[PDB]
């Protein structure tokens, strides 16, 4: 299963596929893997619906816990630190991808942040502009590498994220592509200076149909 | 990967998906798994492109070798026997599905034949009317169970076979569904009294598009 | 052994087979696997008569314990949360939960089905149906083709019994309707008026019609 | 899966179930496990359709090969000896049950013979009057123990064999009971002084429904 | 290590990196992995210099042996069959074969690419490109986005070198163009006039242009 | 991945590569492995970005904790002792390399100190003048062996450190060389009597570009 | 690595080599393995620089801890007992060699003591006059056996100890010989009635040069 | 144990250390690991005295056997092929040679090494080393190779590479000044393969030691 | 068990102990391990009486077989080659020690030869002047290292060989020392230009007693 995240001018976008498998068998088609955790952060886990929701819930609780006790939210570095303590504690398994926006960073245009975790539970701030986790991550990363120059705003960003997920599904059977028959598409979250918001199903649906139409044409031109 | 086969009044049809995987990675999209082996038989293997074609090739050579030596082709029972020996020998891996038409059977409407193999290399003539092998075979068989009453001829036979493969792909990631973007659809063979012929890609495409439209 | 559950317009239905096996030997023929746990929920476990009753009993006690202490029942999300804590605690067979959210905005789609994976993770089913056990794949593939026929509670109960029949038809670990002994699948139906046990006679008439229809 | 055999005054009867399983999954419902091997013998294997027919075929060829070469058939002791050599040769999982009638025995009323094989491939002559092999053997043997006193002829002998198989199916999920929906019933062979004959599907059906009516 | 192959209008091109590793240590920088095997074929192995040269040599001997004995070369299908017999015999590495079928009906599409899976099974590639080795997934994903640009031999060769560049950028076992030592990927092109080794100088210009474009 | 450290007259320099791998796959290109831990020390770990920063952070907190509580910083021997207790505690993995300047040493020219750790968590003061840890350590050490005579001051030392890392990258695929395309170069810290300072990226870019032009 | 210890009339001498290895690779050339632990004792461990110094430090702390608490130092028997408790505690690895001078012994000429430890952590007071621990111990012991008759005082003791270490290096690659290029020689401690002292490096250098010159 | 080989303008030089070890114990001090196999080749094995001499002897017999049977010696490619068949048959030697049939006599020197799988490799880097001290010897040659302008400086660098291998690897033996035992070496040019006199290597070893001191 | 061999001006001497053990138990006290194999050679194996004699016998037969067939004995190089082929054949256990005199060597004073074998069956010509094999070889070699300068002739050589064996016994329980109670002493062979001859027991006895009185 795959989760992607990318920085765009003024923010960050995170998107995840909807499949879950038990071996070769498809066990889920509506799996939500990306969740808003506070006003400026979102987490994505390339695992089951339960692992994704339970992790996000527990992290959301810790952040808001601190806010009620201390009156102010944690700094971005403090949010990662607490996430890292939570990830290292569960190693007793799928690793999280965090998308955030640092409201206290000097340059607002590059205040988007992406943090990933390696097998040993070690955090990493991504400086390449994008990242992906899961079984289709290499395919999604190699796709974003070629398409990243096209990201100039939020919608451009969301489009590239959806195309990266499409490319992950095209080459990895564990990642689900857009289901045009059932009307199920990747979920996404966008985060900028105004906060974290869920992207409406209608725009992701428009974009997924457009990528498919576009690939169908390119295929007929090459044959 | 999945191969299906069903009997219809007057013949038999066999169809297979086009995917091949290396774990979670998709390694093939144009994989042909069903091949005509003689004028009245076809074999399908739910494995790689090479295992499918190599097996079919060796079996086709063996059936034609006998015909050239003895002047007449083997009886259907003899064809299965030779296949069984070939299969047992190899077991010392994916299992073959054989579809054929017994030109010497008393009743021409039920002369279609489907033969499968179990893990131990044992043959089984299917009497249920249909069969499937591969990772999505349970899903395909359960689908055919509910749709078999609709089979009334070769076209309704071809439709049910494509729908069974669609259901296998819908529930099993190792089985490939119809790729509308690339124009890749399941391959099929239909065998009746006039012999075994490859079903044109165009007819499978129309049937695949109608199953999709119907579910949407 | 197989348990199935499906959402119909106005509620949910859950049904389970009556067999239990010890390897290849039939050890039970009247095994009840589906139990009402509170006014709006039912649990089904595809295991032995003991695991099924013991789990349901502990869960029912936990729900009622909450209600007596706090005066009001748990919200549906809270019920699942408590069930999940119970399932994860036993891991250190998995249940299928059917319910009706009395607080959901649309009463027609207020039915809920929750299943658990090997790791003890919960999953709210959006497809309309679910099955657990050794015959689950067969039951699910059968409901896939018959779900369009579900228009009310009775047609919903008929499709549940047919899914179980289909599960028994190709899984020896799931028991079909025994016409000789008069033993049929058990079922629970939950709507706005609460969870009620489906009478044996109704399941019997339906099982008899499915058999004659296949014959 | 289960095969049963019993001696009655004047001959022997052998009957087998129709199921085959891959773990918990039902893979067959029309599995024929009992086959006539020569004019006076029949073999039954509690395994797959393939193991059952392949074994019976090789054994039938061996018996007829001897008859053509030497002009006369082997004595009953010689038939068992050849079977034993065949069983020990394959075991270097499923073990055969052989029912036969010794045309050269002094008492025609007790000329019926039942021979079974053990996990080590050793032959056994059953002097208990009945025997059973397979996953439901214990249940079938315990059933025959209580019903054997009712065996007085070929018909009663056949009723008891069908009831033993019914009891095996009632307690063992690997053995298939009579399918009233599909019309599939246990297969049976009866051997007396006039030779080995397949029992008509209709007679076993009538006996199976009689058992079901009796138990309800 | 990585080998790439792609079909272009009128032929085929195959290129390979120059690195060899013993665990994490770089053991070779001049490793030639792609060799011409007959007038119309080339083989590439993503292994050591020895495995690549020894395999190519034995295969080239087998193709010429047949030609001398029978007077005519094997058909393309026969060349693959012989290669497959050689690969299955060694398994009891995994080559990429690129060729041009002089007997095909359409000369523009006469280019052929054959790869082998872990079990020694052959696969004719109908996608237009293929890659083998530790950086093969990165090279294939790169060619997927750049293939629309392949319109002739020169552009076929630019995409091949860019695919290898992308493999090296993401996989430490694949070597990128060494501007310090002047070592670049080796390539072979096949069209209707036969197979030929691509001059080091043309590969160096392409590699210099790909690097200037990335910075 | 590799970290190198060398003593120069009047001080010490520590430099580290920027790569991180996950088997054969490059997972990082911007990995900072060397961090200033107090006014006179720096730690370098040849591991992931997280292990390097988390270790340095905990050690920096420990050194400052003591200074605030006791009013004066720990002696150099005390700093090593605290580091050793921390390293032995984590084993119950990649090992640290400490570079520091002993402000209380009698001879300021040789007041630079280098401290490493072995597999068992044992400390060691290098007397050779240089040291390296990680997968390219032999290559870096063998390179410094031949170039150490050229070290006369901080800039000479820094050159030899960057060249050692270049030689580690040239022979070890797990160590990253200077990326001229992305503009990513090794990070370095220099410590003398005036304290620990991060070497500007532009000075390292200048050294690396020149080592490349030199070998061209 | 090797540590040697020998009794001379009036005291005891302990000397150790300077090498450390990581398999076949030389990891250290300046490794100090012998340390004075109190006014009358010294410990030597044939292990890493860290294991040797950490062990000696902890033991020195305990001996001085007792002296400050009780006003008088432990008897020699008490010092061994405390060392043994420390060795058994770490084992539940390299074995300690202790050299001392019993200030309370009746005959001052034979008051020198050598204590070694076996694999199980058991102490042993050597009555042979000399002992050695480490990978070159057998070669050093074998050498002292032939040269012990020459030990008539502290000077001769030190000369023989250096020759035993030289012989260990000549036959065992894990033991380092005198490095005339770098000017690194074995370390030594002499203990007599006046206390434990570090032997000056120039003195060991002179002895090493004379042994080398003699064998040429 | 370590064997080094390097190409110089006009030929090739191969040198090997003299130690052999049984685990940690020094079992040999006079071990000859480099042997002339024909007029233009030499083999070196970083193993025991027996493995080195036995291998060289069988290979020398094979080369001369061909020459007597066919009248002409094998081409350089044929010599490698025969060596490769011999190595794969037993399962790491280092071969140094001069190709008398090469177009340019200044670069006719050849160095062939073998990997763990028995695969041959012609070295285009100018030098190579095999054995337990090979990484140290190669890193040393990397920095000193620019100094190689003839046979004399080629040999000096070879001896220095072996010195560096011994300085960092206990399994490789350095020059024993006490016993007068030094590395052995073979130099091959257009005039054939000749053993380097012990006196020349001793002169070089002493100069390297005075230089590091 | 231990075998030693040494070169003296004009020849070579080989001597071996007399013990054999089965674990900790002494199983032999009269074990002869050194045997003359031809006019100019002797073999010694540090194993059981049987392994030592059977090996020497097979090798002696091989050398004489060649001499009778070809008329002349093998050259020294040929004798080692044949021995090596024999050793490698048995290893696909204890390894042999061969002492010989090369009658065709240019310098008669240094014509003595000693050849040993390593674990892999590889031969080695000794250039140190002496060698030893077995469980006490290290002690015997270290003893000879200090005593070799005393070897000026055959008597000096034999004296040193007996002292090396004594020292091996002293330090290793598996090697037997001179038994004064039973009158059992090491066996020895001396080889010069006049051939190989067994040293009289009486000469070894007076040498052994002198060494013992010397150590007392």
Curated annotation (Swiss-Prot), chain A:
How the protein is activated or inhibited is described as:
The formation of the proteasomal ATPase ARC-20S proteasome complex, likely via the docking of the C-termini of ARC into the intersubunit pockets in the alpha-rings, may trigger opening of the gate for substrate entry. Interconversion between the open-gate and close-gate conformations leads to a dynamic regulation of the 20S proteasome proteolysis activity.
Q: In which pathway does it act?
A: Protein degradation; proteasomal Pup-dependent pathway
Q: Where does it localize?
A: Cytoplasm
The UniProt keywords, alphabetically, are: Autocatalytic cleavage, Cytoplasm, Hydrolase, Protease, Proteasome, Threonine protease, Virulence, Zymogen
Q: Which GO terms describe its biological process?
A: modification-dependent protein catabolic process; proteasomal protein catabolic process
Q: What are the EC numbers? A: 3.4.25.1
Q: Which reaction does it catalyse?
A: Cleavage of peptide bonds with very broad specificity
- The answer, when asked if Phosphoprotein is one of the entry's keywords, is no
Query: Which Gene Ontology terms of cellular component type are present?
Result: cytoplasm; proteasome core complex, beta-subunit complex
Primary location recorded for the protein, binned into one broad class: cytoplasm
Query: What are this entry's molecular-function GO terms?
Result: threonine-type endopeptidase activity
- Name the enzyme group at the top EC level: hydrolase
**What's its job?**
Component of the proteasome core, a large protease complex with broad specificity involved in protein degradation.
Q: How does it assemble?
A: The 20S proteasome core is composed of 14 alpha and 14 beta subunits that assemble into four stacked heptameric rings, resulting in a barrel-shaped structure. The two inner rings, each composed of seven catalytic beta subunits, are sandwiched by two outer rings, each composed of seven alpha subunits. The catalytic chamber with the active sites is on the inside of the barrel. Has a gated structure, the ends of the cylinder being occluded by the N-termini of the alpha-subunits. Is capped by the proteasome-associated ATPase, ARC.
Family membership: Belongs to the peptidase T1B family.
Protein name as catalogued: Proteasome subunit beta
Q: Which organism does this record belong to?
A: Mycobacterium tuberculosis (strain CDC 1551 / Oshkosh)
Gene from which the chain derives:
prcB
Swiss-Prot record, chain H:
* Catalysed reactions, as listed in the record: Cleavage of peptide bonds with very broad specificity
* Subcellular location field: Cytoplasm
**Hey, which pathway is this one from?**
Protein degradation; proteasomal Pup-dependent pathway
- The answer to keyword RNA-binding applying to this record is no
Q: What EC number(s) would the UniProt record show?
A: 3.4.25.1
Activity modulation notes: The formation of the proteasomal ATPase ARC-20S proteasome complex, likely via the docking of the C-termini of ARC into the intersubunit pockets in the alpha-rings, may trigger opening of the gate for substrate entry. Interconversion between the open-gate and close-gate conformations leads to a dynamic regulation of the 20S proteasome proteolysis activity.
The processes (GO biological process) annotated in the record are:
modification-dependent protein catabolic process; proteasomal protein catabolic process
Instruction: Please state the protein's primary subcellular location.
Output: cytoplasm
Keywords of this entry: Autocatalytic cleavage, Cytoplasm, Hydrolase, Protease, Proteasome, Threonine protease, Virulence, Zymogen
Membrane-crossing residues?
A: none
Per the record, GO CC terms?
Answer: cytoplasm; proteasome core complex, beta-subunit complex
Q: Enumerate the GO terms in the molecular function aspect.
A: threonine-type endopeptidase activity
The entry describes its oligomerization and partners as: The 20S proteasome core is composed of 14 alpha and 14 beta subunits that assemble into four stacked heptameric rings, resulting in a barrel-shaped structure. The two inner rings, each composed of seven catalytic beta subunits, are sandwiched by two outer rings, each composed of seven alpha subunits. The catalytic chamber with the active sites is on the inside of the barrel. Has a gated structure, the ends of the cylinder being occluded by the N-termini of the alpha-subunits. Is capped by the proteasome-associated ATPase, ARC.
Query: What family does the Swiss-Prot or TrEMBL record give for this protein?
Result: Belongs to the peptidase T1B family.
Q: What does this protein do?
A: Component of the proteasome core, a large protease complex with broad specificity involved in protein degradation.
Which protein are we looking at?
A: Proteasome subunit beta
Organism, by scientific name, is Mycobacterium tuberculosis (strain CDC 1551 / Oshkosh)
What stretch of the parent protein is included here?
59 to 279 of 291
């Amino acid at each position: 299963x795959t989760i992607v995240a990318l920085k765009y001018p003024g923010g960050v976008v995170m998107a995840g596929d909807r499949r879950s498998t038990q071996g070769n068998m498809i066990s889920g088609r509506d799996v939500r893997k990306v969740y808003i955790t506070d006003d400026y952060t979102a987490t994505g886990i390339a695992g089951t619906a339960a692992v994704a929701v339970e992790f996000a819930r527990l992290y959301a609780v810790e952040l808001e816990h601190y806010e009620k006790l201390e009156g102010v939210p944690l700094t971005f570095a403090g949010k990662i630190n607490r996430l890292a303590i939570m990830v290292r504690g569960n190693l007793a398994l799928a690793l999280p991808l965090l998308a955030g926006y640092d409201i206290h960073a000097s340059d607002p245009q590059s205040a988007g942040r992406i943090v990933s975790f390696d097998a040993a539970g070690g955090w990493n701030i991504e400086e390449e502009g994008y990242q992906a986790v899961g079984s289709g991550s290499l395919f999604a990363k190699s796709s974003m590498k070629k398409l990243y120059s096209q990201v100039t705003d939020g919608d451009s960003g969301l489009r590239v994220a959806v195309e990266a997920l499409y490319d992950a599904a095209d080459d990895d059977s564990a990642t689900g592509g857009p289901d045009l028959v059932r009307g199920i598409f990747p979920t996404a979250v966008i985060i900028d200076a105004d906060g974290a918001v869920d992207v409406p199903e209608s725009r992701i649906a428009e974009l997924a149909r457009a990528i498919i139409e576009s690939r169908s044409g390119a295929d007929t031109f090459g044959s």
